């Protein structure tokens, strides 16, 4: 099927400042932060959009922090609590009243094993769309 227009080229999640004091214990984490991916002007005949997610993972399975803080990871979920680690896909239905599609996702930082250290948090997740 024909591709939609990708309205969301770029989407930034600002997790703010986390404190090593607060991230001493395993499983400590930031709040979830919403991030949306939007597609518009889907051709007639396009009824489903699949997003494929890719980014560097560490040995915890979650996304690697590519900033300087150690012992912290990034987690991407859908709207329903499902983890979308690298290689995951998600499919949504095109809304035929507007011929648009959306991916309501959420991101947080977490220290899987505890002991996050001072430094930056930086990560990027690439999305490729397929259509049917």
């Amino acid at each position: 099927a024909k591709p939609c227009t990708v309205s969301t080229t770029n989407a930034t999640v600002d997790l703010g400042d986390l404190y090593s004091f607060s991230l001493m214990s395993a499983g400590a984490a930031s709040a979830w932060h919403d991030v949306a991916l939007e597609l518009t002007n889907c051709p007639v005949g396009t009824s489903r959009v699949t997003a494929s997610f890719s980014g560097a993972a560490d040995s915890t399975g979650y996304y690697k922090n590519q900033g300087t803080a150690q012992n912290i990871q990034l987690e991407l979920q859908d709207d329903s609590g499902n983890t979308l680690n690298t290689g995951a896909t998600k499919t949504v239905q095109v809304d035929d009243s507007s011929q648009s599609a959306h991916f309501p996702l959420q991101v947080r930082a977490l220290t899987v094993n505890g002991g996050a250290t001072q430094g930056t948090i930086q990560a990027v997740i690439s999305i490729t769309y397929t259509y049917s």
Partner: peptide, 15 residues
Amino acid sequence: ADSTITIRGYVRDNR
């Protein structure tokens, strides 16, 4: 490729 999610923040240690 089609979209990029950028995640940014900081871990501060004031000890």
